[PDB]
Paper text:
In order to function, collagens require the specific chaperone HSP47 for proper folding and secretion. Proper triple-helix formation as well as exit from the ER of procollagen molecules depends critically on HSP47, an ER-resident chaperone belonging to the serpin family. The interaction involves Gly-Xxx-Arg triplets exclusively on triple-helical procollagen. The arginine residue is located in the so-called Y0 position and forms a crucial salt bridge with an aspartic acid of HSP47 (16).
While homotrimeric procollagen molecules, therefore, always expose three potential binding sites per such a triplet, so far invariably a 2:1 HSP47:triple-helix stoichiometry has been found. In these complexes, the two HSP47 molecules bind to the leading and trailing strand of the triple helix, while the binding site of the middle strand remains unoccupied due to steric reasons. In all our previous HSP47 cocrystal structures with homotrimeric RGP motifs, the arginine residues on the trailing and leading strand each bound to one HSP47 molecule. There is no space for a third HSP47 molecule on the middle strand of the collagen triple helix. Exactly this configuration is also seen in a hitherto unpublished structure of the HSP47 double-mutant H273N/H274N, which exhibits a decreased dissociation rate off collagen at low pH. Although the complex of this mutant with the collagen model peptide Ac-(PPG)2PTGPRG(PPG)2-NH2 crystallizes in space group P21, which also has not been observed in any other HSP47 crystal form so far, its structure is virtually indistinguishable from the other structures of HSP47 in complex with various collagen RGP model peptides of different length.
Author numbering:
A (entry chain A): 35 to 367, 375 to 413
B (entry chain E), D (entry chain F): 1 to 14
C (entry chain G): 1 to 13
E (entry chain B): 36 to 366, 376 to 413
The structure:
């Protein structure tokens, strides 16, 4: 599969992903969560590639890769980024773009442009918030072009203007190994809370899925294989409507191994919301809480390897993803009593590359689109 | 094949 | 056709 | 045939 | 319908609300099940066989003072016969009315003919000296009238020296859109928030006229019956609560306001399935509405029934077997839940003549705790 350096960085990006998820889940302001572990690691890798002194060491700090050299980190993350990006193309729809926006007074250094494009496929563009709407439109047009309109907008505003903006635009659409029938679709209610219901469209299918029912913890967990079993989507959900905080306290890497080992192929009636979930995170505050303190500081950032001068600081790290839940998948082929997996309330989901075991995605759906 | 599951039940009493 | 609605929920806190 | 019944409703208000 | 039958349809509906409210305040009454046209026919029989104030009080409770005795009997007869045969094609409806007189009493021949011509009234003689044998004749006749669906009127008859008017009924609504006979399971019916009875429920989702009164926290839905000649309307609080508050809002004009606010929405209706059997003695309640002398041994003038003033209206038995079933004619946003697992009020209304065929409430279904 992947090289030794890409495999160890894959395990560290997964630990960083769960770890970033928990920090955002503890943030009372964060609702929907959607993180790509390799894209988050690449964002930190770019800071190490363009930073000096503590700015770069803190970037390798969050990555837990200080004991690694700069070259084997970039070569490892670069391979891991390109490997998982296309090992999950052939099966599911997956579009990724990374663009670094600098102020007009900034000139990107030539060595940083070459290595950041070779390792992380990073694009470089210059922007001016002179016309703040025109600047926002340039980002949204780039994101829409990268995702073919599936993500037509990154952010509605940019609070920090005098710095560098790293924008990752993503579109992910799981292609099921066994498709839902497009007529098994109707309008139902999604209970965001016990007192707040949003009208959504739901898709329904009953089949054989790896399933575990935890009567002790009062939760359901199901594994939905993606096309040709090259990856799988795992969903963790409480039995009844409740905040996901209790389930997240059980959400560890070791507890997941216990749940994965207890699953058995059972008849499961899976009902999922249908539609595109658009999530845009500015990981700046949350990456700072993990150790990336100086890179985002106007007064103490050393990003001189990006531009030649200490005129840049990391203003925002946009992690924007459009995640489409749809019925499409591979065609498939009778008296069992199906387990009910009725996902009309917040849940946690993981996308797992069945080959390398790498975490492709981690997130939670709290609020779908809909007028209530 | 069987149809979709029914909707969620009504809320409980206060 | 869709099945019947589920049973009524438990009482509140 | 008709599908299964839906899940139990949510709890009532406090 | 004729002009006189049309006016009697509107006034029998007003009599239904007035009669329902009186029984709802009676702490001894649980389930209520009344056919307004059958009640109106009973008052017509008192007017047909009564004299002086006994007969005029019958038209008073009927609110038919502007009609004379001639047009009241002919109007109710057509109205009863119209609804009996205009709804003999859609829903199952079996009605019997029998007047039981003492054995020493001989029903006058003209009264037997006119009461059978207008009200299809049967006449029989009984003596409660052997109380068990007399009760069996009334209950055997009711079971015969309803083909076993109503095998029993009453378990005892307190007033023996008078006349007993017995109405035996079986009514089974036939939906314009049937429930699937497999969409049936066992659930809990909350009689109160502290008392739950195990019942069977039937479930269907479809387009129904619906109104949600968020201020009063009640739901009201219109279920069309077969071929849309009548509708079954259900009034229900959002959660389980005593019906006393909702009954206070239940007027003839308020019903017009609620029906005027309805819109066809997707509704998932869940109803108890089974036969509800209710037997009322309307004697006490009809007196409270104005029929005071007919039930009094010392001042009843029912001489047109039997030739002697030895008769008074002892009891007016109104016994109904009302079956909730899935059967009906064979036949989209996110449906509202109309989950009838707690007491509710229901009305069956003939959409053409506006006559109210039934009004009642289900408080206690059959079952165990």
């Amino acid at each position: 599969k992947l090289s030794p350096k890409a495999a160890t960085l894959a395990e560290r990006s997964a630990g960083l992903a769960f770890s970033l998820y928990q920090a955002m889940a503890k943030d009372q302001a964060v609702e929907n969560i959607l993180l790509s572990p390799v894209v988050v690691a690449s964002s930190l890798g770019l800071v190490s590639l363009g930073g000096k002194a503590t700015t770069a060491s803190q970037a390798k700090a969050v990555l837990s890769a200080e004991q690694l050299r700069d070259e084997e980190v970039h070569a490892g993350l670069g391979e891991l980024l390109r490997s998982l990006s296309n090992s999950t193309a052939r099966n599911v729809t997956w579009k990724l773009g990374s663009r670094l926006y600098g102020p007009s007074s900034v000139s990107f250094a030539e060595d940083f442009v070459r290595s950041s494009k070779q390792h992380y496929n990073c694009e470089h563009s210059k922007i001016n918030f002179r016309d703040k709407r025109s600047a926002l439109q340039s980002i949204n047009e780039w994101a829409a072009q990268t995702t073919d309109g599936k993500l037509p907008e990154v952010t509605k505003d940019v609070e920090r203007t005098d710095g560098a903006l790293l924008v990752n635009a993503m579109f992910f659409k799981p292609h099921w190994d066994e498709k839902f029938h497009h007529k098994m679709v109707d309008n139902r209610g999604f209970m965001v809370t016990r007192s707040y219901t949003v009208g959504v469209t739901m898709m329904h299918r009953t089949g054989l899925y790896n399933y575990y029912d935890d009567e002790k913890e009062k939760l359901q967990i199901v594994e939905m294989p993606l096309a040709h079993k090259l990856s799988s989507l795992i969903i963790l959900m409480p039995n009844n409507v409740e905040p996901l905080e209790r389930l997240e306290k059980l959400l560890t890497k070791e507890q997941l191994k216990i749940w994965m080992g207890k699953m058995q192929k059972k008849a499961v009636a899976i009902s999922l919301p249908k539609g595109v979930v658009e999530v845009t995170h500015d990981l700046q505050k949350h990456l700072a809480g993990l150790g990336l303190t100086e890179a985002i500081d106007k007064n103490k950032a050393d990003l001189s390897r990006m531009s030649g001068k200490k005129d840049l600081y990391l203003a925002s790290v946009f992690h924007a993803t459009a995640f489409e839940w749809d019925t499409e998948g591979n065609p498939f082929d009778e008296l069992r009593s199906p387990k009910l997996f009725y996902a009309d309330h917040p849940f946690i989901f993981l996308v797992r590359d069945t080959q390398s075991g790498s975490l492709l995605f981690i997130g939670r759906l709290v609020r779908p689109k809909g007028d209530k | 094949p069987p149809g979709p599951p029914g909707p969620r039940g009504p809320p409980g009493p206060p």
